[PDB]
DNA sequence: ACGCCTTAACCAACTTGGCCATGGAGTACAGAAAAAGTATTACTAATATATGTTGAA
DNA sequence: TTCAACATATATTAGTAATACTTTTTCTGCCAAGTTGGTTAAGGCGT
């Protein structure tokens, strides 16, 4: 009662609740509903919009839509209708504003290439580069440099030049790029069933797998098409060095951002289990390999089709050797002089690899120094949870759940046997843990059909649920925090109009640091929560 | 409790359901004011209507 | 209230009611099943009708 | 043992010697004062106590009898689950460098909330 | 409460005439309301013992065939009794029996305590005392006062016989009433005079029955009755009245209970006298009761019966006592000299025979006194008046209990005029409360006066100072027979021997459970 | 060629509200311990019934 | 027979002080239709 928490603003809205405020926190206005309604109901048509939103028809419809396009906030499909002409139905990009939802953290992705110029105007340069990019999202050095002054050495005003390529940075949006993945797989599922030279009408398996093969291997060069394209990378005009292709607009490259932050986690978790010497070694080693590892990207194909209880493994096996061998060529065998702050003899000092043991790494070419990879990242992921509940709720929940890990569907005696303290606490910690997810429940009929108190009560992990509940977390501040940010705007909104155009009153002076360092608390507090959220949303 | 099995613990889906249950006889079937009831007796010299 | 004794009121049953519909009398329903039956005004809200 | 307490006592007692079992003593005075490449090649160190604890338990200074290596392993199992130690190759064991707990950031300790007045907090059940 | 909107009449008249059943005031003609909207057709230690308490309550209640309604009175009383923690300390049958008795008494019904109680094993004096306690613990007044006028009916119903009994009943009642008038009634069980007039007017109606039959409903003895039978035979104009005409005598004669006639058996101004003064004396060292009990003229040691040493002395004819901790209670003390001086004598055996145990903390726990006014007084009304500060029940005890708050003393009352004032720790309070209530004493009389001075004799502290207050003054007041009150070692090896031959099982169980201590360990 | 398993249509099992209207009186398991409060267990020490018995006339 | 007389109880205030005793107080062990499953028939599918 009395709105102070306001469960309305909160409790009843899964998932999209983030989105519709993000775009709101971005635009709102006309642009708010279309994404909200979209993610709500799913597939939607232009004509189909205004029969729901009442959204200023076929203007803000068109306007907001092309807005999202420019910023690639939607997934975008068109095809002929079944009678003819052409029809356009729409989805929402990835997590979309997910791009925006990092931003300053994507700004931190620069801090990898903060190197080679440290604390320079070059820093501010690449800064305005990136955010100008990300505000529009697709630009050319022809368009950008065009807007930029043409009196500052071309190969310097825009100093990031060859550095435009690297791993992250930009890739031209093409066709499939923001096109919905789940279907465009089905689009490739054509031309194989669709091209059958009336071969034999038996065993669709021979039709399927082969089509699958095609569907597989065709899709590969499909997604490998953005992975690298030389016409960008290669161009070296006369009396010049190698440049990108200034012609086509390129767009933020999200992959190496994923792999980068996931790295940062591994710096933390590994850093937890090893020493800062061995740690920083692992840290600088990963700086090379984070180039090559998809690490969130592999799903792709898994997303968009039913597995098969065998063929699921027929995907898993591909992930077993993939990075381990062929990208293993790109991976650690002998690396030389990474940084050093240590000094003097660097060799057995570099044999500190073998100090890696558990629960990860520590697999090499039996006498070259190498870390397992495409096998590593997967069983690494499974471990990543660990600490996630301790002062989350209670210390004792750890050991039991951890124990609940090793054993499975046991019961309280065998708990209290294995466990310690008192049933007075054991129930509490357990019960206060069962209040959401974790343990779930198991029970079996005891000398009855099914009855209330007869049977036995058992406990289970099911990280499927667990790893899939931490979105409730997303529903906490990533839900809320954005509001009390926005809600605090209308507080100073009057002053916000004036105070922004000024560069007056004592309370103004006070509430400056209040609302502002307040914004430090919210935004920083967010990114705090984000570093945690960086996992269960993807792997 | 009791526990000699008092039959009509039921209060609700019932009160909305059948016969005297509202949504037929107590709502569409309202028992309406301004009326009167008596027995009959013939009056031929009274006109029809 | 119910029947004779305590005090009056008389029974329009459904089977009794619908006989009026065969004559299709609009208002006779209202005066009968409404204005003389339970006289009430609900106050509501266009937005989120309640 | 017995169904009541002061196992936690004898636990945190054995945890001490367990911390000794791995590298030299705490050296937590300043930040990096560990084994310094773990003496020579921690690969050479494959170590644990198990039965030894009983020879270690000889100290007593407490009211109890001895206890079987089986139930010794049971005592080990909690700090496995509490993650104070590590279980490698059965009877071999490690420390989780717990000590950094005993003494951006993702550790629960070494973290304190503001948690007064301001509405900007993260509780857990801000949605239940 | 509601008022018209226009005429603002404060009175509303309901019209049920035409069966509009409306409400309107004779001041306006503008109705108050339309169609008055009418209707139609856990587990706690307390609450559970209220379940069981209703079970017991009702069950045992109408085992008497008492009215159901009346039971709920006690149910509140019982519940009320739960509030003051009067309930827990003793048996339940006491409780429910009490609270029902306070109902029926307060409600003036026909049932009897000795009777009602008799539903059990009970001595009936027990639950009587239980009822007596809640008189303290709850706070009540003159409410529970009855007469045979009721109980003759319930008795008359039980004897069957013929309907002339009713005619007899009318004959009996006024009969007893004149007997109530002639003042032989109070101070005795009303059932006695009840069955008395039964045998009298049934005798007047000449139907031959037995005293067994009478006391059968009366639940008293027979000789008990005939004491009251011939106790009528001697009364005023008894044989002059006892003949026919249904005793139209309304007259009195005198009113002279035999009470003060037994005062004639030895035949303010009369001063109440000291009897005993209850006190205590602290020694200051705890010691072995048997070790001192070894050599004495007057002592007994049997912790089996009670744990203490029985101590008494023929001079100055005082008892007192000893405790184990080095404490004692002074008893049998008629005055303070004889009290404190003998109280010192007890330390003389001690420092002489046993340990040191000096004489400390001599403090009066109570003082007893008694008096008589030599004439009858009416308690029935006195209680009816002062039953606020007074308590009496007819069969619970013959004398009347008075309670004075200022000062705080219980007063023992008799129509003989004999009054026992006791419960005070101070001498002067005796005559303070005594002469204080004396205006009530002479106030109630039927058809001396000088208190002299309110304080005449010296105070308590005077006689207290007349005896050595220093614990180490002992040999000074030694009678020199206390030198002889010790006994030889032979009579200890013989007396004490007999004690051991008797108590070797008592001490045997002591030391045996003391061995269970060793067994307790294992 | 021939057999195998997989998918799916059928059919027999268990399944559930209906059941004139109007009146018109008529209508929580049993067992334990811990706490706590009182009775007894001696004494005055004074009652006057009440009772018992026995016993002496 | 009637006395009679004698003893017991009895209500208070003290007590200790101790044991013993009950409580309270937790605190616990009749038809149409869906519904299933049990059957079969086809049908790939590999032999
Ligand atoms: Zn509304
Ligand atoms: Zn009026």
Write a brief structural summary.
This is part of a larger assembly, with chains A (539 residues), B (49 residues), C (50 residues), D (128 residues) and E (522 residues). Chain B is largely without helices or strands.
Major protein interface: A-D, 48 and 36 residues
Helix share bin of chain D? 25-40%
* Biggest pleated sheet of chain D: 2 strands, antiparallel
Tell me which oligomeric state these chains represent: part of a larger assembly
Overall 3D shape of chain E: extended
SSE run of chain D: HHHEEH
Q: For the terminal residues of chain E, how far apart are their CA atoms? A: 79 Å
Shape descriptor of chain D: globular
Question: What topology, given as strand order, has the largest sheet of chain E?
Answer: 7-4-8-12-11-10-9
* Radius of gyration of chain D using CA atoms only: 19 Å
Straight-line N-to-C gap of chain D: 40 Å
Structural class of chain E: alpha+beta
Bound ligands, named by name, code or SMILES: zinc ion
How many strand segments of chain D?
2
- Helix/strand-derived class of chain D? mainly alpha
Helix-residue proportion of chain E: 40-55%
Largest sheet of chain E: 7 strands, antiparallel
Distinct helical segment count of chain D: 4
| Beta-strand residue fraction of chain D | 5-15%
Structure description:
It is classed as transcription/dna. The structure is cut from a larger assembly and holds chains A (539 residues), B (49 residues), C (50 residues), D (128 residues) and E (522 residues). By secondary structure, chain A is mainly alpha-helical. Chain A has 24 helices and 8 strands. Chain A is 49% helix and 5% strand. In chain A, strands 1-3-2 form a 3-stranded antiparallel β-sheet. In chain A, a hairpin with a 7-residue loop joins strand 2 (74-79) and strand 3 (87-92). With 49 residues, chain B is mostly loops. Chain B is elongated, with a radius of gyration of 21 Å. Chain B starts with 21 loop residues before the first helix and ends in a 17-residue tail after the last strand. In chain D, 30% of the residues lie in helices and 6% in strands. The longest helix of chain D is centred in the first third of the chain and has 14 residues, at 7-20. Helix content of chain E is 44%, strand content 12%. A 7-stranded antiparallel β-sheet of chain E has the order 7-4-8-12-11-10-9, covered by helices on one side. Chain E has a 3-stranded antiparallel β-sheet with strand order 1-2-3, with no helix packed on it. Classes of the chains: A mainly alpha (539), B little secondary structure (49), C mainly alpha (50), D mainly alpha (128), E alpha+beta (522). Chains in contact: A-D, B-C, C-E. The A-D interface holds A 5, 10-11, 268-269, 272-273, 275-277, 349, 352, 354-355, 358, 386-387, 390-393, 395, 398-400, 402-403, 406, 418-420, 436, 472, 475-477, 479-481, 484, 518, 521-522, 525, 528-529, 531-532 and D 7-8, 31-32, 34, 37-38, 41-43, 74, 77-78, 80-83, 86, 88, 96-97, 104, 106-109, 111, 118-120, 122-124, 126-128. Residues 4, 6-7, 9, 25, 27-28, 30 of chain E line the site of one zinc ion. The structure holds a DNA duplex (57 and 47 nucleotides).
